[PDB]
RNA sequence: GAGUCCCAUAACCUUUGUACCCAGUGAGAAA
RNA sequence: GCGAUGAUCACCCAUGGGUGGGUACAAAUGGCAGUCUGACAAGU
RNA sequence: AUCUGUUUGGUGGAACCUGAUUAGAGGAAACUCAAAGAGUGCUAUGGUAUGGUGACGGAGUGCGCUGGUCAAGAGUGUAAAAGCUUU
C-alpha cells in the first residue's frame, strides 16, 4: 500500500502513466494506492488548472485515508504516518520529501522517472 | 423532534421530557458535543417528568433481564401508559427516544402510537443523562444508584451463569481450614485440662488417653465417687474407681474453674464431628466422585491444598499431591483422582458412578500387585 | 449447546486429522490429556483437539477453560479412535496438541487449520 | 524513619551496587538513589509447587 | 454524520435534476419511517424513482433501488415534485406533468415550442408551477386550469427560481446578468427587489425556511447571503478549494447552507457565521 | 456472632429488628445493606453450621470473661496490693514474667519498671544508647492517665510503689487481703501524678 | 523463594517495583492471604501493632497490560480511584491486578461472555468486592447498559476481528469524555494475511474513525510476538 | 535523666521425644 | 487374556533388623542472656 | 605492633575549568495580610417567565381539538371479488 502525493500525481499525468497499472508493473505486485485527505486538499487548492489531476485522483481504484490534524501539509502528514507504522511505500517526487523518506529507515520510495515508476528502498523487486 | 426520553436504570424507570432539541446537522461539532458534558446546558435540554422505582431487587432482576433481551415488562407498560400522550397511530406518532433498537419493536407492539428513535441524537441524549445521573433526578429515589448497580450486576451475572451455592466449594475450603484449627485447639485445651487435673490424680490421663472421653468423665467426677456404673462411657472404669480409692494427688474455686474449662473442651469436641459430618455431606453433594474414590476428608484436604475444585480439576494429573509398587500406586491414584475431579467439577449436577468405576479400577490395580 | 460444543463436521475433521498425522510424524504433536494440559500451561501449543465421545466428557472438558485463559484454539473431533489412529499410536487418544515450532515443515498447513477452527470458534 | 533506615541501610547499598555482585548478571544502567518511601518485604512462595524456587 | 446512506449509478449522462418524494401510490402504502424516496431525471431520456433504507426510527426489524422508471422520448433538464398528490413535473425539450402511478406524462404544459431549463413547484398554494426557458423566459403554470398562466421575457437567462415559503406568491429568480430578482406573481411588470452584489452569472438561489433571507451561489466561485428587504449581500462565502458553485440549498433548520460546487464537493456552511449551535444558558442568550 | 444468631438471613433481617446488639445507629446501615447487596442466598444445611460457629464463639467469649474473673479473683487473693496499685492482669503478667512472686519481690524497682522491655534494654546497653522507660508497666491505668515525659516519670514512681506493695504482699505473714498498703501507695502515686500534671512548661 | 525485596512506588500510581537481584512488577493485594493464579506474593509488615499487608507479582508473560507497563507506557489510565471497563475478562488473571491497582475506592466491570470463566470471575469477585462481573457479550452493550454507568477507562483484551467496533460501542455507551482507551491488539487474531504493521495501522485508523485519539503505541515484543497496546483517549469532539 | 506498646507475651540455635524421606519424563510393557 | 482414560524411569547381612543425615510437631530451671540511673525537682 | 598503606565510609573543599544565578543564600511559625493559577463541587434549569393591571377570575353553554369504532364515498384491483389505499 502506497501513499501518493501531489507532485507524484502531476508527474504521472505528465509522463502518461496510469496510477495502479504503473504501480503494478513497477513492483510486479498488487498495489493499493492511498490519497490522504491532505494530499487531496492540496490537489483541490492547486486550482482549476489541475482539474485533470484532481479527477484522476478521484478514482474508485485509489482508496483514501482520513488524516486527523489541522492544516493541509501533506509532507508532514506522510512523514508522520510512515514513521509511525513502517507498512507503507511512499510515492513522491519532492526532493525534500524524498530526502526525508530515504533518511528514515525501512521505508521504500517510489518516484516517476523516465516513462515508468521506479522504486528504491524495497529490496525485493525482482 | 425527539419529544420524550426513556432511561432505564437499576432503581427503576425514568421518563424525561425533551425541552429543547439539540442540533441535528451540527451534531458532530465541538460545542454540541461538549454541551452534554456541561451540566448547566444539559438541563436546558432534559427535564424529568416521571420516575417509577422498582419494588426491590427481585423486580429489578426481572426488569434487567427483560431490558437485556429486549422486551417490554409490566412496569415499563405502566410508566409508558402513564406518561406518553394518546397520539395517533397513523399520523404524527409520539416520539420516544430509547437506547435499544431491538427494544423499540417491543414498544411499538404494545403502543402503536409511539415511534421509537435510537440514533446518534438519542444516543448522546441518553449518555448525557447517564453522565449526570443523580443530579437530574432532583433527589427522588431511595438507594444510591451505584450501590443498586453493584447488587444488580452481581444478581444478573449469577442468574446468567446459574451460580449455585450448593455446589460451592468455598464452603468445604473453609470447613476443612477451620477443622484443622479446631483440631489443634481441642488438642491444646484438653492438654491444659489434663495438666490442671494432673494434680488431682495423675492416672486418668494414663487409663483414658482420649481427650473428649477424659474431659467428659472429669466433668462429672470431682471427688471420690464407688457407684461405678455410669462411668463406663467396665475394666477401665473399675481400674479408675480403684485409683480413686488409692488417690495419690492433691480446691473449690480452681476446681470449678477447671470444670468450666473441661466444659469448653467438650463443647469444642462436639462442635467438631458436627463440622466433620457437615463436610462429609457437603463433599458428597459437591464432589461425590472424589469422595467415592479417596474419601471425604482426604478429598477435602485435596481440594483445600489445591485451592478450589476448579484448580484441582485444571491441574495436570502428574502434578497432584495425594496423601516401587507402593510408589506407583500413588501415581495411578493421582491420575485417576485428577480424572475424577475433572468429572466432578465440570459436570453440572454430578452422579457417583464414575467415582465408583475409578475406585474399581484402582482396587483392581492394587489387587494385581 | 452441548458441553463438547465446537464440534467439527466431516471435511474439517479430516483436514484436522491429516495435519495431526503429519505433526505426529514431525514430532510436533503432544498426545494425551495431561500432556496436552502440560504443554498448554507451558504455552507451547498452537491448537488442541479434544475428542467428543470418550467415556466421561468432563475428563477433557477441563481443557477448554485453559485454552480460553491463554487464547488457544480448541476443536472437537467426533472420534477418539480415529484421533488415536491419526496420532499414530496403538490406542485411542482423547486429546492432543500441536506444539509451536518455526523450524517446522508444516507451518502453513497448521496455520490454515488454525484459521478454519478459529472461524468455527 | 532514620531508626529503620539504620537497619536496612546495608541491603539498600547492595541493591544500589547490584551490578558488581555477580560477574555474569550485567543490569541496565540506572542510578537508583534511595527512594523516599519504601518497604522491605519477604517473598511468600506458596504451598503449591515445591523444590524449584523453594 | 456527514456520510452517505447509499450511492447509486443512476444514469449514464448528467443527472440533470433530482428531487424527493412521498410517493402516493394507491395500491401500496408508503413506508416513510424507513424508506426515503428520491427521483431523478437525466439527459438519457429517463426519470427514475429510488427508495433508500433510512435509520431514523427503530420501529421495524429491503429492496432499496429503482422502484420504477419513467420514460420520455426527448431529454429532461429539470424536475420538481408536487408537495402532495403523487405528482411531479419535468422540464426539458418540453415540460410534462407526471404522477408516480402512470408510466407516461399526464399532460404537456408548454407555452410554445421553446425548451425549458428549470422548474420549481410552489410550497404553499402547491398547485402553481414556475419554469425557466432558454428564450430568457419565466413562465408560471397553474394546475387547476392545467395550463400556463403568464410569462415574462427578461434580458438574460433565468438559471433558477425559488418560491418564498412564507409568502406564497413571491419568488426569486437567479439569472445570468449577475443579480437576483424578487418578483410578485400577481404583478410581474416589476421586480420588488434586485439583489446585486454578484460579479458573474448567478447559478442557484434558495430561500431560508423563515422566508427572511436568501442564499445565492454564482459562477464566480463564491456564494452570497442576502437579507430579503435590502438588495445587497449580507455575507459572502468563498474558498480557494471551491470552484463554480452550481447548486445552493438552505437547510430546513434555517441555520446551515449546503453548497454543491463543481470540483465534486458538497459543503456545509453556517448561515450566521458568528453563531454557534450549542444550547445556551440564559445569561449568554441574553 | 450474636447478630447472625439473631437474624440468619437478609429477608429475615428485613422482617426483624434488634437493639440489644449493634447500638442504635448501625441498624439503618445493616438494613440498607440487607436491601441491596452483592451477597448470595445460603441454604439451611450450612446456615446450621454458621449458627453453630456463631454460638461457639459466643460461648468462647463467655469463657474468656469468666477466666478473667478467675484471674482477678486469684490475683486479689495472692498479691492484692499489686492489684490495688497496677491492676489485675498487669500484675499477673508481671508475676508470670518473673516466675515466682518472691522472685519478683526480691527485684529492685528499676527492674520492675523495665521488666517487659528486655530486648530494647539490652540492645541499648550493649551499644551505648538510651534505655527504655516503660517496659511491661506501660499498660497501667496511671501511666495511661499521664501524658508526655511524665509517663516515664510516673512509670518510675509507679514501679517504686509497686516494688513496695509487691514485696509487702510476698513477704508479709500478717497480711489481710484487703488492699491497704496498695491503696495508700496508690494515693501517693495519684497525688504525685496530680502535682506533675498541674505544672505546665508554658509561661502564662 | 524466601528472599527479601524492597518495595518502591512506580511512576504509575497504584503499582510498585520490588527490587532484589531481579526486580518484579508488583501490585498491592486486595484479598490478602491467597493467590489467584499461582503467582508469588510479598508480605511486608507495615506499621495497635504493625499489620502484615501483602503484594502480588504481576507476570508479564501472562498479562498484556503488565507487558505494556514494563515495556514502558507513558500513560496508563488505570489509576487508583478510577472505574475500568475490562472487556474480554477471559479469567481473573489480569482483572485481579487491574482490580487492586484501581483500589477499594474504584470499580472494575469485568465483562466476559463464556460461562466457566464467568463462574471463576464470580468466585474471584467475592473476595475482591470492587469487581462487578458482567457475563454478557460485549458486541451488544445494550444488554448490560443497565448494570454499568460512566466508566473512566476501557481496557480491551478481546481477541476478535470486530474489535474496533466492540471498543467503539462500549466507549460510546459508557466512557466519559477524555477518558482512557487501552487496547491490546493481537495481529494474528485480527487477520493473518497481512503483516502486523498493516493491521496495527488499520486498527489505529479505525479508532480515530470512531473518534478515539491514539496517544501512544507499544509493541510489547519480548513477551509477545506480534502484539501491541494502543493507548488513546476518547476525544469525542476534535481529534484535531 | 532515660529507644519498649514495633511481638523477652518473642526470635533463632541446641538437645530430647513422635511420623516420614535419604517429582518431572513421555511409549513402552510382557514373552 | 496391557497401555496416552498414561508404559517407563545413605553404610552392613544368609519379606526382617542394625547405624545415622533432613522434614514437621511438642518440650526444656538448655543456650544466646546480661535485668536502667541515683539526689534533686517544682513553686514564691 | 614507636608494622603497614591501600581500600571503603564520614569530615573538609585550595588552583584551574564548566554551568547557572545575582538589590548574597536561606530557614521557621499562622484562627496573619494580600496578588494570581489550576482543578473540583452545587439544579447550575425563563427558547422568549405567575392562571388573572373587574381590562379579571370561576361555573355552564356553543364553536374548535384528540382517539378508536362503525357506515358511506372515492381510487386501485377483479369474471365477480376479496384485499389495499384515502388531507
Ligand atoms: Zn493528512
Cβ contact B113 with chain J strand, < 7 A: yes
Residue G53, phi then psi, degrees to nearest 5: -105, 160
Q: Which chains touch A (3 or more CB pairs under 8 A)?
A: E, G
Does C41 contact chain G (CB < 8 Å)?
A: no
Strands E96-99 and E87-92, sheet pairing: antiparallel
Question: Closest residue of B to E254, CA-based?
Answer: B25
Nearest nucleotide to F136 by CA–C1' distance?
A: H4
In this structure, what C-alpha cell is assigned to residue G4? 527479601
Cβ contact B19 with chain J strand, < 7 A: yes
The Cα-based distances of E114 to E95, E132, E134, E154 in angstroms read 10, 10, 7, 15
Nearest nucleotide to B191 by CA–C1' distance?
A: I26
Whether A and B touch, i.e. at least 3 CB pairs below 8 A, reads as: no
Distance J50 C1' – B52 CA (angstroms): 29
Chain A residues close to E265, C-beta within 8 Å: 44
| H or E element in which residue B331 lies | helix B325-346
| Calpha distance F150→C1 (Å, rounded) | 78
| E160, E174 Cβ separation under 8 angstroms | yes
Q: CATH assignment of C1-121, given 3.30.420.40, 3.10.20.70, 3.30.70.3450, 3.30.1330.30?
A: 3.30.1330.30
Distance J48 C1' – D18 CA (angstroms): 76
| Calpha distance D21→B221 (Å, rounded) | 69
Burial class (CB in 10 A: 0-12, 13-18, 19+), B97: buried
Does B109 contact chain E (CB < 8 Å)?
A: no
| B96, B72 Cβ separation under 8 angstroms | no
Q: Which of residues 44-63 of C touch strand I (CB under 7 A)?
A: 54-56, 59
Does E243 contact chain A (CB < 8 Å)?
A: yes
Q: F45-78 burial string, b = 16+ CB within 10 Å, else e?
A: ebeebeeebbbbeebeeebeeeeeebeeeebbeb
Does B20 contact chain E (CB < 8 Å)?
A: yes
Contacts of D45-52 spanning 24+ positions with Cβ under 8 A: D45/G1, D45/G2, D45/G40, D46/G35, D46/G38, D46/G40, D46/G41, D47/B305, D48/B307, D48/G35, D48/G38, D49/G38
Question: Closest residue of A to G235, CA-based?
Answer: A68
Nucleotides of J under 7 A from a protein CB: 42-47, 66-68, 75-77, 83-87
Q: Shortest CA distance to A9 belongs to which of A95, A71, A91?
A: A91
| Calpha distance F141→E257 (Å, rounded) | 87
The residue with cell 429475615 is F12
**DSSP notation for G138-154:** TT-GGGSTTT---EEEE
Residue E104, phi then psi, degrees to nearest 5: -145, 160
Beta bridge partners of E217: E204, E223
Cα of A85 vs centre of ligand 1, distance in Å, is 15
| Calpha distance F132→F126 (Å, rounded) | 13
| G91, G120 Cβ separation under 8 angstroms | yes
Contacts of F159-164 spanning 24+ positions with Cβ under 8 A: F159/F109, F159/F110, F159/F112, F159/F113, F160/F109, F161/F85, F161/F185, F161/F186, F161/F188, F161/F189, F162/F82, F162/F85, F162/F86, F162/F91, F162/F109, F162/F112, F162/F137, F163/F107, F163/F108, F163/F109, F163/F112, F164/F109
Whether F and B touch, i.e. at least 3 CB pairs below 8 A, reads as: yes
Chain B residues close to C66, C-beta within 8 Å: 314
Cα of G208 vs centre of ligand 1, distance in Å, is 13
| Calpha distance G5→G19 (Å, rounded) | 5
| Calpha distance D46→A104 (Å, rounded) | 50
The domain limits of chain C are 1-121
**DSSP notation for G153-187:** EEEE----TTHHHHHHHHHHHHEEEEEEEEEEEEH
The residue with cell 433538464 is E77
User: Who contacts B249 (Cβ-Cβ below 8 Å, separation ≥6)?
Assistant: B198, B199, B200, B201, B202
In this structure, what C-alpha cell is assigned to residue E244? 463554480
Dihedral sign from CA coordinates of B230, B235, B240, B246: positive
| F58, F2 Cβ separation under 8 angstroms | yes
Residue contact C68–G186, C-beta within 8 A: no
The Cα-based distances of E232 to B118, E193, E208, E210, E213 in angstroms read 44, 10, 16, 19, 11
Nucleotides of I under 7 A from a protein CB: 2-9, 26, 33-38, 42-43
Q: Which chains touch D (3 or more CB pairs under 8 A)?
A: G
Of G91, G186, G192, the CB nearest to C69: G91
Of E58, E279, E280, the CB nearest to B104: E58
Nearest nucleotide to F104 by CA–C1' distance?
A: I35
| H or E element in which residue B325 lies | helix B325-346
Give the residue with minimal CA–C1' separation from I4.
Answer: C32
Looking at chain F, how many residues does it have?
A: 204
Does C73 contact chain G (CB < 8 Å)?
A: no
Distance from CA of D49 to the nearest CA of G (A): 9
Does C34 contact chain B (CB < 8 Å)?
A: yes
Distance from CA of C69 to the nearest CA of G (A): 6
| Calpha distance A32→A93 (Å, rounded) | 19
The residue with cell 423486580 is B59
The experimental method is: cryo-EM
Which F residues, 112 through 141, put their C-beta within 8 Å of a C-beta on chain B? none
| Calpha distance C62→F30 (Å, rounded) | 40
Distance H28 C1' – C90 CA (angstroms): 11
Nearest nucleotide to B92 by CA–C1' distance?
A: J66
Question: Closest residue of E to A50, CA-based?
Answer: E263
Residue contact E58–B118, C-beta within 8 A: yes
Cα of G156 vs centre of ligand 1, distance in Å, is 28
The Cα-based distances of G143 to B67, B334, E45 in angstroms read 7, 44, 52
| Calpha distance D37→D1 (Å, rounded) | 10
Instruction: Please give the angle made by the CA atoms of B292, B296 and B300, to the nearest 5 degrees.
Output: 125
Best mutation site among A6, A44, A55 for testing chain E: the one with the most E CBs within 10 Å? A44
Q: Which of residues 2-21 of C touch strand I (CB under 7 A)?
A: none
Distance J53 C1' – F106 CA (angstroms): 105
Q: Backbone dihedral region of G193: left (phi > 0), alpha (psi from -120 to 50 degrees) or beta?
A: alpha
Cβ contact F131 with chain I strand, < 7 A: yes
Of A44, A51, A58, the CB nearest to E241: A44
Q: What is the DSSP letter of B309?
A: H
Beta bridge partners of E131: E119, E139
| Calpha distance B176→B304 (Å, rounded) | 7
Instruction: Please give the angle made by the CA atoms of B201, B203 and B208, to the nearest 5 degrees.
Output: 125
Q: Which of residues 76-135 of F touch strand H (CB under 7 A)?
A: 93, 97, 113, 116-120, 122-124, 129-135
Amino acid at each position: 500500500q502506497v501513499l501518493i502525493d501531489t507532485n507524484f500525481i502531476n508527474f504521472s499525468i505528465q509522463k502518461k502513466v496510469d496510477i495502479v497499472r504503473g504501480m503494478m508493473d513497477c513492483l510486479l505486485a498488487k498495489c493499493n494506492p492511498l490519497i490522504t485527505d491532505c494530499v487531496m486538499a492540496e490537489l483541490e487548492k492547486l486550482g482549476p488548472k489541475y482539474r485533470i489531476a484532481l479527477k484522476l485522483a478521484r478514482d474508485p481504484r485509489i482508496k483514501r485515508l482520513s488524516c486527523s490534524h489541522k492544516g493541509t501539509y501533506a509532507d508532514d502528514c506522510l512523514v508522520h504516518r510512515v514513521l509511525q507504522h513502517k507498512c507503507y511505500i511512499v510515492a513522491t517526487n519532492d526532493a525534500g520529501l524524498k530526502q526525508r523518506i530515504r533518511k528514515i529507515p525501512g521505508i521504500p520510495l517510489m518516484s516517476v522517472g523516465g516513462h515508468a515508476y521506479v522504486i528504491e528502498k524495497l529490496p525485493d523487486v525482482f | 423532534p425527539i419529544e420524550y426520553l426513556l432511561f432505564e436504570e437499576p432503581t427503576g424507570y425514568a421518563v424525561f421530557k425533551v425541552k429543547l432539541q439539540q442540533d441535528d446537522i451540527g451534531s458532530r461539532l465541538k460545542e454540541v458535543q461538549e454541551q452534554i458534558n456541561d451540566f448547566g446546558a444539559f438541563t436546558k435540554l432534559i427535564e424529568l417528568v416521571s420516575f417509577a422505582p422498582f419494588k426491590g431487587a427481585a423486580e429489578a432482576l426481572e426488569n434487567a433481564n427483560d431490558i437485556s433481551e429486549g422486551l417490554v415488562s409490566e412496569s415499563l407498560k405502566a410508566i409508558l401508559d402513564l406518561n406518553l400522550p394518546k397520539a395517533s397511530s397513523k399520523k404524527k406518532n409520539i416520539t420516544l427516544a430509547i437506547s435499544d433498537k431491538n427494544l423499540g419493536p417491543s414498544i411499538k407492539e404494545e403502543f402503536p402510537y409511539v415511534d421509537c428513535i435510537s440514533n446518534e441524537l438519542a444516543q448522546d441524549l441518553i449518555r448525557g443523562v447517564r453522565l449526570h445521573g443523580e443530579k437530574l433526578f432532583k433527589g427522588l429515589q431511595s438507594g444510591d444508584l451505584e450501590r443498586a448497580q453493584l447488587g444488580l450486576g452481581h444478581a444478573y451475572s449469577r442468574a446468567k451463569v446459574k451460580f449455585s451455592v450448593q455446589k460451592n466449594d468455598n464452603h468445604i475450603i473453609q470447613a476443612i481450614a477451620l477443622l484443622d484449627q479446631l483440631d489443634k485447639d481441642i488438642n491444646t485445651f484438653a492438654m491444659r485440662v489434663k495438666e490442671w487435673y494432673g494434680w488431682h490424680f495423675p492416672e486418668l490421663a494414663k487409663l483414658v488417653p482420649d481427650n473428649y472421653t477424659f474431659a467428659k468423665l472429669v466433668l462429672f467426677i470431682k471427688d471420690k465417687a464407688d457407684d461405678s456404673l455410669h462411668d463406663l462411657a467396665n475394666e477401665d472404669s473399675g481400674i479408675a474407681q480403684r485409683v480413686i480409692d488409692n488417690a495419690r494427688i492433691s480446691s473449690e474455686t480452681d476446681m470449678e474453674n477447671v470444670c468450666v474449662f473441661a466444659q469448653r473442651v467438650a463443647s469444642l469436641a462436639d462442635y467438631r464431628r458436627q463440622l466433620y459430618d457437615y463436610l462429609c455431606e457437603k463433599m458428597h453433594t459437591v464432589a461425590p466422585n472424589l469422595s467415592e474414590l479417596i474419601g471425604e476428608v482426604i478429598g477435602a484436604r485435596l481440594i483445600s491444598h489445591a485451592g478450589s475444585l476448579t484448580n484441582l480439576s485444571k491441574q495436570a494429573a502428574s502434578t497432584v499431591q495425594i496423601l516401587k509398587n507402593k510408589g506407583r500406586i500413588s501415581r495411578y491414584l493421582a491420575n485417576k483422582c485428577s480424572m475424577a475431579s475433572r468429572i466432578d467439577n465440570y459436570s453440572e449436577e454430578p452422579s457417583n458412578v464414575f467415582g465408583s468405576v475409578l475406585k474399581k479400577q484402582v482396587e483392581q490395580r492394587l489387587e494385581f500387585y | 449447546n452441548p458441553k463438547a460444543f465446537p464440534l467439527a463436521d466431516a471435511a474439517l475433521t479430516q483436514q484436522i486429522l491429516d495435519v495431526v498425522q503429519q505433526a505426529a510424524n514431525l514430532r510436533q504433536l503432544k498426545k494425551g490429556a495431561n500432556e496436552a494440559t502440560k504443554t498448554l500451561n507451558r504455552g507451547i501449543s498452537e491448537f488442541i483437539i479434544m475428542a467428543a465421545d470418550c467415556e466421561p466428557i468432563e475428563i477433557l472438558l477441563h481443557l477448554p477453560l485453559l485454552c480460553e485463559d491463554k487464547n488457544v484454539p480448541y476443536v472437537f473431533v467426533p472420534s477418539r479412535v480415529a484421533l488415536g489412529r491419526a496420532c499414530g499410536v496403538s490406542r485411542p487418544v482423547i486429546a492432543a496438541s500441536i506444539t509451536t515450532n518455526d523450524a517446522s515443515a508444516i507451518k502453513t498447513q497448521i496455520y490454515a487449520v488454525k484459521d478454519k477452527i478459529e472461524t468455527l470458534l | 524513619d532514620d531508626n529503620m533506615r539504620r537497619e536496612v541501610q546495608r541491603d539498600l547499598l547492595l541493591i544500589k551496587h547490584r551490578a558488581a555482585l555477580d560477574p555474569k548478571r550485567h543490569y541496565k544502567k540506572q542510578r537508583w538513589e534511595v527512594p523516599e518511601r519504601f518497604a522491605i518485604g519477604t517473598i511468600i512462595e506458596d504451598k503449591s509447587e515445591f523444590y524449584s524456587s523453594r | 454524520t456527514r456520510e452517505e446512506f447509499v450511492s447509486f449509478k443512476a444514469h449514464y449522462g448528467l443527472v440533470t435534476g433530482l428531487c424527493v418524494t412521498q410517493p402516493r401510490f394507491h395500491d401500496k402504502k408508503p413506508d416513510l419511517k424507513s424508506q426515503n424516496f428520491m427521483l431523478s431525471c437525466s439527459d438519457d431520456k429517463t426519470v427514475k424513482l429510488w427508495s433508500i433504507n433510512v435509520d431514523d426510527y427503530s420501529n421495524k426489524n429491503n429492496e432499496e433501488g429503482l422502484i420504477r422508471t419513467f420514460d420520455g422520448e426527448s431529454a429532461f433538464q429539470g424536475i420538481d415534485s408536487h408537495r402532495e398528490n403523487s405528482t411531479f413535473a419535468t422540464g426539458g425539450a418540453k415540460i410534462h406533468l407526471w404522477d408516480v402511478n402512470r408510466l407516461k406524462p399526464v399532460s404537456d404544459l408548454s407555452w410554445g415550442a421553446d425548451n425549458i431549463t428549470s422548474l420549481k413547484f410552489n410550497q404553499n398554494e402547491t398547485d402553481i408551477l414556475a419554469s425557466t426557458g432558454s428564450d430568457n423566459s419565466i413562465v408560471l403554470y397553474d394546475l387547476r386550469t392545467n395550463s400556463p398562466t403568464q410569462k415574462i421575457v427578461q434580458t438574460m437567462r433565468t438559471n433558477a427560481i425559488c418560491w418564498n415559503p412564507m409568502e406564497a406568491f413571491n419568488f426569486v429568480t437567479a439569472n445570468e446578468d449577475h443579480n437576483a430578482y424578487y418578483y410578485d406573481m400577481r404583478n410581474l411588470s416589476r421586480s420588488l427587489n434586485v439583489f446585486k452584489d454578484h460579479v458573474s452569472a448567478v447559478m442557484d438561489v434558495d430561500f431560508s425556511p423563515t422566508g427572511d433571507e436568501i442564499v445565492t451561489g454564482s459562477y464566480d466561485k463564491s456564494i452570497r447571503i442576502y437579507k430579503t428587504n435590502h438588495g445587497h449581500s449580507r455575507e459572502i462565502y468563498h474558498t480557494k478549494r471551491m470552484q463554480h458553485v452550481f447548486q445552493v440549498k438552505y437547510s430546513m433548520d434555517s441555520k446551515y447552507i449546503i453548497s454543491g460546487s463543481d470540483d465534486g464537493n458538497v459543503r456545509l456552511w453556517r448561515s450566521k457565521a458568528w453563531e454557534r449551535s450549542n444550547v445556551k444558558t440564559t445569561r449568554e442568550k441574553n | 456472632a450474636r447478630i447472625i444468631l439473631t437474624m440468619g438471613i437478609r429477608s429475615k433481617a428485613s422482617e426483624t429488628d434488634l437493639s440489644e446488639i449493634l447500638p442504635e445507629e448501625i441498624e439503618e446501615r445493616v438494613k440498607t445493606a440487607a436491601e441491596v447487596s452483592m451477597g448470595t442466598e445460603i441454604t439451611q444445611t450450612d446456615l446450621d453450621n454458621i449458627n453453630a460457629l456463631a454460638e461457639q464463639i459466643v460461648e468462647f467469649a463467655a469463657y474468656r470473661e469468666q477466666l478473667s474473673n478467675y484471674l482477678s479473683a486469684r490475683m486479689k487473693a495472692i498479691a492484692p496490693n499489686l492489684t490495688q496499685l497496677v491492676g489485675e492482669l498487669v500484675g499477673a503478667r508481671l508475676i508470670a514474667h518473673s516466675g515466682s512472686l518472691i522472685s519478683l519481690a526480691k527485684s529492685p524497682a528499676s527492674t520492675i519498671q523495665i521488666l517487659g522491655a528486655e530486648k530494647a534494654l539490652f540492645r541499648a546497653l550493649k551499644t551505648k544508647h538510651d534505655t527504655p522507660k516503660y517496659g511491661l508497666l506501660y499498660h497501667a491505668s496511671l501511666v495511661g492517665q499521664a501524658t508526655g515525659k511524665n509517663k516515664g516519670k510516673i512509670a518510675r514512681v509507679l514501679a517504686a510503689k509497686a516494688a513496695v506493695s509487691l514485696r509487702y504482699d510476698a513477704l508479709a505473714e500478717d497480711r489481710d487481703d484487703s488492699g491497704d498498703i496498695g491503696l495508700e501507695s496508690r494515693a501517693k502515686v495519684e497525688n504525685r501524678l496530680s502535682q506533675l500534671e498541674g505544672r505546665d512548661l508554658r509561661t502564662t | 523463594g524466601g528472599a527479601k525485596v524492597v518495595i518502591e512506588p512506580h511512576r504509575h500510581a497504584g503499582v510498585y517495583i520490588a527490587r532484589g537481584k531481579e526486580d518484579l512488577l508488583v501490585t498491592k493485594n486486595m484479598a490478602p492471604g491467597e493467590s489467584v493464579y499461582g503467582e508469588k506474593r510479598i508480605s511486608v509488615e507495615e506499621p495497635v501493632p504493625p499489620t502484615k499487608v501483602e503484594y502480588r507479582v504481576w507476570n508479564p508473560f501472562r498479562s498484556k497490560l503488565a507487558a505494556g507497563i514494563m515495556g514502558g507506557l507513558d500513560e496508563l489510565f488505570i489509576a487508583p480511584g478510577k472505574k475500568v471497563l475490562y472487556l474480554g475478562a477471559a479469567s481473573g488473571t489480569s482483572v485481579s491486578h487491574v482490580s487492586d491497582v484501581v483500589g477499594p475506592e474504584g470499580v472494575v466491570y469485568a465483562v466476559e461472555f463464556s460461562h466457566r470463566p464467568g463462574r471463576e470471575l464470580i468466585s474471584m469477585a467475592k473476595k475482591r468486592p470492587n469487581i462487578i462481573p458482567i457475563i454478557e457479550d460485549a458486541r451488544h452493550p445494550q444488554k448490560y447498559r443497565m448494570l454499568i454507568g460512566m466508566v473512566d477507562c476501557v481496557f480491551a483484551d478481546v481477541a476478535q476481528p470486530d474489535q474496533a467496533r466492540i471498543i467503539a460501542l462500549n466507549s460510546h455507551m459508557f466512557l466519559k469524555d477524555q477518558g482512557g482507551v487501552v487496547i491490546s491488539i493481537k495481529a494474528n487474531c485480527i487477520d493473518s494475511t497481512v503483516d502486523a504493521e498493516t493491521v496495527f495501522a488499520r486498527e489505529v485508523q479505525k479508532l480515530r474513525e470512531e473518534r478515539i485519539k491514539p496517544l501512544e503505541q507499544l509493541t510489547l515484543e519480548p513477551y509477545e510476538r506480534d502484539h501491541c497496546i494502543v493507548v488513546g483517549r476518547y476525544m469525542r469532539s476534535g481529534l484535531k
